[PDB]
Amino acid sequence: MPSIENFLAYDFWQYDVIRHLFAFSTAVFLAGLVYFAMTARTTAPNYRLSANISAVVMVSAALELGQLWLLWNESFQWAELQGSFVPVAGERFSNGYRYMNWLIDVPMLATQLVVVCGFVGTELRNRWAKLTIAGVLMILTGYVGQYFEPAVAGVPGYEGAEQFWIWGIISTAFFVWMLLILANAVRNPQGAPSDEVRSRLKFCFWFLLATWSIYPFAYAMPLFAPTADGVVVRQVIYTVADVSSKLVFGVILSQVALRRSAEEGFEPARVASG
Ligand SMILES: CCCCCCCCCCCCO[C@@H]1O[C@H](CO)[C@@H](O[C@H]2O[C@H](CO)[C@@H](O)[C@H](O)[C@H]2O)[C@H](O)[C@H]1O
Ligand SMILES: CCCCCCCCCCCCO[C@@H]1O[C@H](CO)[C@@H](O[C@H]2O[C@H](CO)[C@@H](O)[C@H](O)[C@H]2O)[C@H](O)[C@H]1O
Ligand SMILES: CCCCCCCCCCCCO[C@@H]1O[C@H](CO)[C@@H](O[C@H]2O[C@H](CO)[C@@H](O)[C@H](O)[C@H]2O)[C@H](O)[C@H]1O
Ligand SMILES: *C/C=C(C)/C=C/C=C(C)/C=C/C1=C(C)CCCC1(C)C
């Protein structure tokens, strides 16, 4: 079944805002990529994998929010007689472009925190092989329950609203579990860090927990408000949870990594940062 976007008529502002936020978190992911590729030579070689990953999750999200921008632009056309952007009769818009490119981001947003915490070799690969299982078994489960939007929302003719709940609870069951490996790789850092860079990991973890709980709120939105200004609101909180969980989180992590690479002894990070 299509999304709940194609069953509604969007006014001028209700459509312009949504395409504007699709262009905004692409002009920002094509700027974060250039920033993360320009000051990736500052972190020490030990924690430069965390800066390379940060440059990967920006190129792998620019094509995620720019291929959805095109899909949003060609799916809807203005209709002056009505006064709204009615859906076109040939193309159907689906937000599932996000959940297919969340397979490159959900793993490589905790793999770059397990790296910053100081985990090397087997201790990092084993903890990556669990997060990359918890992140492709939670997103591939929330991606099955995404297809029952018009059924949970109440569109007449569409049935199967129970699957929206069923395939949504077996996604927060892995989202909670992934936090249990992210909070045992952050409460136990390696390399004997100082008490101030040990309290910044226990901030980068809460900044990852508090931006990953906006996605359960922005999917279950057709349950609550399946309207034009419940789609406008849901593409606001999937961008305030995008530019603040792939960009702000990466920049915050690039400072706690620079603090380790300025107390271990690296000079290009000890001169350019404290
Ligand atoms: C939109 C693309 C991304 C834009 C990100 C903008 C970040 C700057 C916003 C203000 C943050 C204030 O905090 C400031 O952060 C910058 C960047 O992390 C740090 O800057 C330090 O680390 C960065 C990243 O390795 C180096 O390029 C820089 O030479 C160095 O000074 C400062 O030491 C810190 O004081
Ligand atoms: C879309 C591609 C994204 C690629 C991101 C890959 C990250 C996932 C790695 C999982 C764990 C494997 O084990 C870990 O691998 C990384 C990368 O190979 C190694 O990392 C090492 O090699 C890489 C590549 O030469 C260097 O950039 C890095 O500075 C260095 O530490 C670690 O020493 C190892 O402990
Ligand atoms: C829209 C344009 C693109 C985005 C540009 C903006 C990016 C900004 C990134 C930098 C954010 C500021 O950097 C982050 O600030 C918070 C402020 O509470 C600091 O956190 C600080 O306060 C907390 C809360 O008391 C303490 O637990 C922590 O020890 C302390 O360092 C983080 O250690 C630092 O990493
Ligand atoms: C940049 C990519 C990010 C931050 C990915 C975040 C992913 C999630 C938090 C997904 C979790 C989900 C649930 C907890 C319930 C079902 C819906 C999901 C799949 C969006």
User: For the chain, which residues make up each domain, given as ranges?
Assistant: 5-270
The label of the residue with tokens 């939670």 reads 138
Q: Can you read off the two tokens belonging to residue 256?
A: 């706690």
For residue 98, count CB atoms less than 10 angstroms from its CB and return exposed for 0-12, middle for 13-18, buried for 19 or more.
Answer: buried
| Cross-strand pairs, 10 | 85
Could you give the C-alpha distances from 8 to 15, 85, 154, in angstroms and in order? 11, 9, 13
The rounded Å distance from CA 153 to ligand 3 centre is: 38
| CATH numeric code, 5-270 | 1.20.1070.10
The ligand that comes nearest to the alpha carbon of residue 131 is 2
Between CA 78 and CA 76 the distance in angstroms is: 7
Of ligand 1's listed atoms, the one at least distance from the Cα of 28 is: 1
Could you give the C-alpha distances from 183 to 35, 53, 175, 206, in angstroms and in order? 28, 20, 12, 9
- Of the residues 36, 48, 49, which should be mutated to test ligand 2's pocket, given the most ligand atoms within 8 Å of the CB? 49
Residues 231, 139, 242, CA angle at the centre, nearest 5°? 50
Of ligand 2's listed atoms, the one at least distance from the Cα of 52 is: 27
Between CA 257 and CA 251 the distance in angstroms is: 10
Resolution (A): 3.3
For residue 244, what is the enclosing H or E element? Answer: none
